[PDB]
Structure formats: structure tokens, C-alpha cells
Design a protein around this nucleic acid. Sequence first.
RNA 1: AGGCGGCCCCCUGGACGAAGACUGACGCUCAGGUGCGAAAGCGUGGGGAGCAAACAGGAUUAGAUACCCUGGUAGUCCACGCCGUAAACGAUGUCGACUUGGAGGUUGUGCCCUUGAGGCGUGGCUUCCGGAGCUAACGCGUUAAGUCGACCGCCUGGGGA
RNA 2: CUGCAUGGCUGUCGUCAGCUCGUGUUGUGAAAUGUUGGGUUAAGUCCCGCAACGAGCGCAACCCUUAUCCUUUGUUGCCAG
RNA 3: ACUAUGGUUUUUAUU
Lengths: 150, 218, 51
Amino acid sequence: ELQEKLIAVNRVSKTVKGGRIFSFTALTVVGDGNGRVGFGYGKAREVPAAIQKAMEKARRNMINVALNNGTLQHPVKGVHTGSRVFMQPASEGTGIIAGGAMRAVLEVAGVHNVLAKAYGSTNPINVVRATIDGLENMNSPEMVAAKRGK
Amino acid sequence: MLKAGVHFGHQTRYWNPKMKPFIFGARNKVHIINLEKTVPMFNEALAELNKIASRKGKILFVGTKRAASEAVKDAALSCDQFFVNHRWLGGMLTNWKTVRQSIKRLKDLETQSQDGTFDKLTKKEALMRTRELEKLENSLGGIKDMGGLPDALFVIDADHEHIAIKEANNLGIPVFAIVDTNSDPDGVDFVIPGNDDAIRAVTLYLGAVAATVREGRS
Amino acid sequence: IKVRENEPFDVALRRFKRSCEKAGVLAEVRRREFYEKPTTERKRAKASAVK
RNA sequence: AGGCGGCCCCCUGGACGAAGACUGACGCUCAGGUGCGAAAGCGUGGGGAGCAAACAGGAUUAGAUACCCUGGUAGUCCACGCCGUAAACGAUGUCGACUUGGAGGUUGUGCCCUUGAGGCGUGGCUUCCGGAGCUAACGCGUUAAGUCGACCGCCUGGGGA
RNA sequence: CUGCAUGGCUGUCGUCAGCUCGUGUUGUGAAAUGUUGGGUUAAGUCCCGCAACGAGCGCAACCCUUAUCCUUUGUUGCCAG
RNA sequence: ACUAUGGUUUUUAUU
């Protein structure tokens, strides 16, 4: 069965005549627990309905990840604007690790063995775009058997 | 297909450097496509359109400009197709779940026109609903029974309708475009190099799909 | 500066002002301007025939 | 680099070209050194029409040792030295190579009835837009803030300094 | 005694023409769009048009009142014969 | 014609 996870929710406000009005902006992930993951971002009134508004996109967006023996076949970068993340594989044991936005993406795909670092902006709404750019940058999962010799 | 439609090139640069694989040697700076890089290339894509028609996929014909704005709704209409002759109302693919209320409006104004519900000696109220109906006909009249979204898009000018080509790329919808030397192919999914105005080119592929949406299968 | 032309009279008409270059009618300047218009209107669109 | 400007005849560094020839890595940057000034100022004497800090008055204002107006000294200029500082700004440190485009100039040189409002090549420069690339976003864009390399200085929150 | 504890009541911008609910798109995002523009109105008026398009609250309407003709009906009203 | 200056402090924001 599929799994849903929150990363963060933040208050967002507009100043008006006689006071102030506010909404929430939420960031979520959806994954299969075996190697497929997607993310949602959205803004609405009340936390649970801002989470529901972010899930509108997470019910469409997905990347399938290339894996070799339960972990990464190579180290890789992920890029979006000022977010410049790096990923590298770990051995069977400890391996997760990483900040609240990067850790959520690794959790919901079962990839609990990657030494993920931000090496740029940690901003949750942009480090997610760089993380999923890195999952799209992954080369095909049997490449060592094709790359041997000539 | 084989040759015909002999032409001498129009305008200079007025170009996109991406078009190197399609252009002939230019004289007096006037630029032209090479007939041997384009006619076999769109004949090779005419089969790709015939396969979508053999799967009964619904094709949208877009011709919002003077050379195609009559032919888009006549040159293949004998084989039944869906069309846009000037405007989309806008967001027609990504906001369809709202834009369907103007299809509901066209259905109401037509079920009124078809029975004379506003045909009276009170003329200003009859013209009120006549003008609003005949204004909806110009944007939604060629798509009112398409039952959902297209399965393929065919567009006369990719520089003009670029906002709806951005919708088609987001939704994974195929885009066939007769891109001009001064256009750009990055939003196009089936590139079939042509023109948007002047000659002897803008209705050429249109005149060929008029049979390949009837022959097959189809 | 020219204008050395021998007319004993002031004329009740515009002959050289407000209509040709440096505004009005031709070479208009300021009085609110628009910047998306040159990237919105390129080819006609009307005049053939409205009637 | 700062900047350079009436014309005429000179003195004179650099750069660019065509055919040849002679060298044979002679290529880049550089710790500390060693050197350039726009304007204003000084050291010493000349030169002194505009102009003009200060000085000397008027106006304005409740006040005006300022604005503004009326006069005006240093100074501006020339020689032989000092001052070394600026939006010195294109807010872009310095050497080379690599790169799809549009539009406009400046100047050599090769071949052509220049039977062409020059044209097609080949060299050196130079300006406004624009796509790939860069980037916090603005800005840069073949003369890049791009791309790949070599080198020298400085910064680590601000106030206090 | 406290609207520096409040439910209600209320002044007023102002009859001013403007404001919400959603969905899409653009933007790193706050934010923008549309609600900006061109005519023109008391008025988002009435048309035109652009990446913005629907459904609501306003504007406008509903209900009330009047100039003249025709009709129905007349006392404790009217008065031409 | 033109038209000087403004002493101290100032939202709950939850899941």
C-alpha cells in the first residue's frame, strides 16, 4: 500500500484594513515504499486543508528511481536554482541521516541507505525541487554490465 | 507524396538557428526550406497521424489566422473533425473543469434557438441571446461534442498559440506543428516544417490529413 | 532659426506647431505609456474589412 | 588608466597589413620593489579678460552668519618640483582558447571591365539587440559575470574604526 | 465603575463602484493575473480586447407613485341637463 | 510671494 508523509507547514499572512488575514503553505510526499516517490506543494486556509491542497499535486507527480542492490549505483547531484544537493550510497547498517525534507523523500521509497547533503539552500520548498531533480538525473540500473570493456 | 507547390522563399532572418537541418542554400539573403528535407519528412509524419485516426483518437485542428481560418473548418469536415478558427476562450485543457460551464451555456442557448424560446416581437431581448450564442459559436462551436480532451493537437502556428502548447506539454498531449523558419520547435512533439502565412504551404498538410482521417481503418 | 519671412500680420491658424515631430499628432512623448503592447500587437487584426 | 578636440607644419612611442626572411618557447602572472592625475591644494616667480571659495553688501524670514541677487581675493594660466586621491563607473581584477544568431559602423589586403548604389574572400577593430550557458534574484551574454585552465591580493555581522 | 472582558446596538467612507468563493497560469516565493487596456456611463455601465475563465454580493431589477386617452363603479363625494 | 517642526511604549497565531 502507498504511503503519505508531511515535511513542514508554515503560516503565511496579508496585512489589510482593520487587521490581518492568514493561510498555511504545506509541503508533502507520496511514495510506494519500494522505489517510486513524488512531492506536493500548496497553499490554503487551515493546516489539514493546506495539506489536502498540496496533495492535489502529489496525486499526479512521481519519479521511479534506478537502484542496484537496495542502494544507489553511483553518487549524483540534484539542482534547482540556489539548491545544489548531493547523494551517495551507504552500506547495510546506518544511512538515514539528512534533514527533514531530504529524509522524507528517502523514507517513502525504502531508500534508507543514502548520505544525502544539501551543499546549497536548505529552504524546504526548493531543496525538494533539487532532490527530485537528482532522482531524475539517475542513470539506468544495470549500467556496470553495459559499461564493462568497450 | 511527391513534390509540387513550387515556391521561391519569403523573408530573410527572420529565422531560428535550430532550422539548419531543413533549410536550402539562401540567395539574396531570402531564406527557404529544402523540399527534399521537408516533403519526405511530413509524409513520414502523415503515417503517424493515420495511426492515431486508426485508434479513433480525437484530433483538434487549430488555425487562428487568415490562411487557415476557413479551411480548418471545411478542408477535412467531410471526414468529421474538431476545430478552433480564432480563439480558445483560454485554459481550455488545464481549466476544462471550469470552461465546461461555457459549453453548458452554448447547450442552453442552442436548446433555446432550436425551439424559438427567445424569437419574439421584443427584438432587443432576442438579439441579446442571439449575439451571446453567435459569440460562443466562434470559440466553442468546433469542440462542443469533443466529450473531454483531444488525443492529439494539430496547430498552424506555434509562435501564436504557444500558451495552449504549454498546456498540451503539461498534460502529455501530442502536438503536430507546421513550424515556420522564424518559429521554434521546443514545445512541439511532431515537427513537420512549413509556414504560417503566404504561399502555397499553410494548407498543404491540412489537405493531406483530409484523406488519412478516412483511409485505414479510420 | 529661419522665420525671416515678411508677414506684417499674425495669422489666426496653426502652421508649424503641435502636429509634426516632438508631439502632438506625431512623435508623441509621455502622457502614460505601455510596455506589453509592443509584445502583444504585431499584425492586423482588423482593418480588412470592419467595414 | 586619468583621459585625449579649432586649423597648419613639425617632433615621437604604440598598433594594423602583404609578400619574403631570420629566430626557435623567446609564452602568462608576479611577494617586496619601480612608475602615471581629473579638479582642488603647495613650493618659486611671472601672467590676469571672463569667472569665483573667502571677503563685502542686499534681499527673504520672527531669525538667515545659507539658498537668491550685486561687487570680488586666492585660484583657473606658464616653468621647475611636490600632492597622488575620484561615480578613475561599463558599480564588470589580469593571459589564452572554445562557442548557434539578428541589426549598424571603422580601417588594411587579394581577385574582379568594381562596366556593383562596390562584390566575394582574408586580416585588425567596434556598437545595439537576442538565444544557449551563469546566478539569491537582479545583472553578464562570443569584447560574457559563460566554459576549461595559470597567477597575485583581500574578506569572515555591524556599531566602536 | 469598566465596550482594555463581551453578546448585541451603532457612527461612517457612500450611491462610492467596488468586493468575495473557486479553478487555471506565471513567479524561487511574497506576489501578479482577471479587477490592467480602448471607447463610453450615475455605474466592472454597454460592446471590443490580453492568460484568465465560471458562481455569488453590489451596480441595474423586484415593490410603490405620476403626466394623457379608454373602461369599471359612486355616498356622508361630484352637479352639465 | 514663499509656507519651521513633531518627546516614551504598543496583536493572540493554535493543530
